[PDB]
Ligand binder design. Structure first.
Ligand SMILES: *[C@@H]1O[C@H](CO)[C@@H](O)[C@H](O)[C@H]1NC(C)=O
Lengths: 438, 49
């Protein structure tokens, strides 16, 4: 049989339900969302890391001429200079009365440390959510893991179970992101082929070990200015360390709902938000006919004591009369309250307690023992402790915090002035006629 | 758990109380003031004889 139900997106929050079929005892169904797995689609754009300038041996043409030539190396620079003043420990490298000239050039390349200090700029889209569900029926536990989509049931025992789509779409990830040393940072990285000195991603490459590179970081050559042969180079500070210094806090400290983000899939997990509708198919053989089910008689409830606690602290008791030994389930069709155990033994005239929780102080509702129903009411008090991180609000508040006494007072407050005005008008018209008599 | 109660100053007078907690049986609490000890601060002034 197939049953439909909506569940909150949250871990460690079992949800209990029942299936009604004529001649079959209502079957307890427990559903647990073990964890969440939001995996988006992303594409590798480029990589960046601290670089190193190249300072190759300059070219010296003595007492003659020469011309500059470009080079395919990324961020390359070249420039000639006449009237050079070459000196070295060995002395004047060559000789002519200041006629000689020298060509200098430089370029950049990623340093060896980059191999492990690389930071990759990622473009992401189409967040996809994966949900793992564990379902208990007839004290039998089955499992499945399915994409949140409502069109691809998973495989578990060759059982087709579907979930979603989500009520709302949530994704902490933004279109542009960066990954560095296992830390993910939300930032609008410059597009590939865009070089801006003193900025993130100044050096860009298709792959870490790509021979072809493109970069621009405003390198300007300086004229020789000293005795010896030297190439003074002026360049802006590397942008990688710049972004490192003031990169801001990591996404791990900014993700809403406490998403637990992992890097190797670049995906979130254990993050709770939204609702999920699901349809569960259960084999008919799993069901049990009511003929063999225990029969109960003259059952009654009693709230020994309840507390309006965030955690599961509510208690209840039931007393029953029966004729057959065995087990029956227990349920509460009121969403405001949730039980703890789904089934229990049954005796001829036994009475058993129950643990439960509620989201309202007016503990009035209907609970079913085995197949039969029964009303049960009480009032609950706020707790002394008022800060706890354990599961809370298994059912969200439904403006039911208002008390029965509050309803009685509000009813006694509003007055029936409409009846007063109606009676006044009626007597007024009657008197008007009586005086039209004259 | 913490509970507040007022007791008379007197020996050999047990006082009984209960603590109410949801889902917990009320726990009997007996309190006895075995004795009193009023100790003041004093300073030696001098001696005579
Ligand atoms: C499940 O509950 C039924 C109901 O009494 C019982 O007969 C059966 O033995 C239970 N299964 C297990 C594995 O305990």
């Amino acid at each position: 049989f197939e049953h439909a139900t909506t569940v909150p997106n949250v871990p460690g929050i079992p949800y209990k339900a029942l299936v009604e079929r004529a001649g079959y005892a209502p079957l307890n169904l427990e559903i647990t969302v073990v964890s969440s797995e939001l995996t988006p689609s992303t594409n590798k754009e480029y990589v960046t890391c601290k670089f190193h300038t190249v300072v190759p041996s300059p070219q010296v043409k003595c007492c003659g001429s020469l011309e500059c030539k470009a080079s395919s190396k990324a961020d390359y620079t070249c420039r000639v200079f006449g009237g050079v003043y070459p000196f070295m420990w060995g002395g004047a490298q060559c000789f002519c009365d200041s006629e000689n000239t020298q060509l200098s050039e430089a370029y950049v390349e990623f340093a060896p440390d980059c191999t492990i200090d690389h930071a990759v700029a990622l473009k992401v889209h189409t967040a996809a959510l994966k949900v793992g569900l564990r379902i208990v029926y007839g004290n039998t536990t089955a499992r499945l893991d399915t994409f949140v989509n409502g069109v691809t049931p998973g495989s578990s025992r060759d059982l087709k179970v579907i979930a979603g789509p989500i009520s709302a779409a949530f994704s902490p990830f933004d279109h542009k992101v960066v990954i560095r040393k296992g830390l993910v940072y939300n930032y609008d990285f410059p597009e590939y082929g865009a070089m801006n000195p003193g900025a993130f991603g100044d050096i860009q490459a298709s792959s870490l070990d790509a021979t072809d590179i493109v970069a621009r970081t405003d390198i300007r050559l300086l004229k020789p200015s000293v005795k010896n042969i030297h190439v003074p180079y002026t360049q802006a500070v590397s942008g990688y360390e710049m972004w490192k210094n003031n990169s801001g806090r990591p996404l791990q400290e900014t993700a809403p709902f406490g998403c637990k983000i992992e890097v190797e899939p670049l995906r979130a997990t254990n993050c709770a938000y939204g609702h999920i509708p699901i349809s569960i198919d259960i084999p008919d053989a799993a069901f049990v006919r009511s003929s063999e089910s225990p029969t109960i008689l003259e059952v009654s409830c009693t709230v020994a004591d309840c507390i309006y606690s965030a955690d599961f602290g509510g208690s209840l008791t039931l007393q029953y009369k029966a004729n057959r030994e065995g087990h029956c389930p227990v349920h509460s069709h009121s969403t405001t309250a949730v039980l703890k155990e789904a089934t229990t033994h049954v005796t001829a005239t036994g009475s058993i307690t129950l643990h439960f929780s509620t989201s309202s102080p007016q503990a009035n509702f209907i609970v079913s023992l085995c197949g039969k129903k029964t009303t049960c009411n009480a009032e609950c008090k706020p707790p002394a402790d008022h800060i706890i991180g354990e599961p809370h609000k298994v059912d969200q508040e439904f403006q039911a915090a208002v008390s029965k006494t509050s309803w009685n007072w509000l009813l006694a407050l509003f007055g029936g002035a409409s009846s007063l005005i109606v009676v006044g008008l009626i007597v007024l018209v009657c008197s008007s006629m009586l005086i039209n008599t004259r």
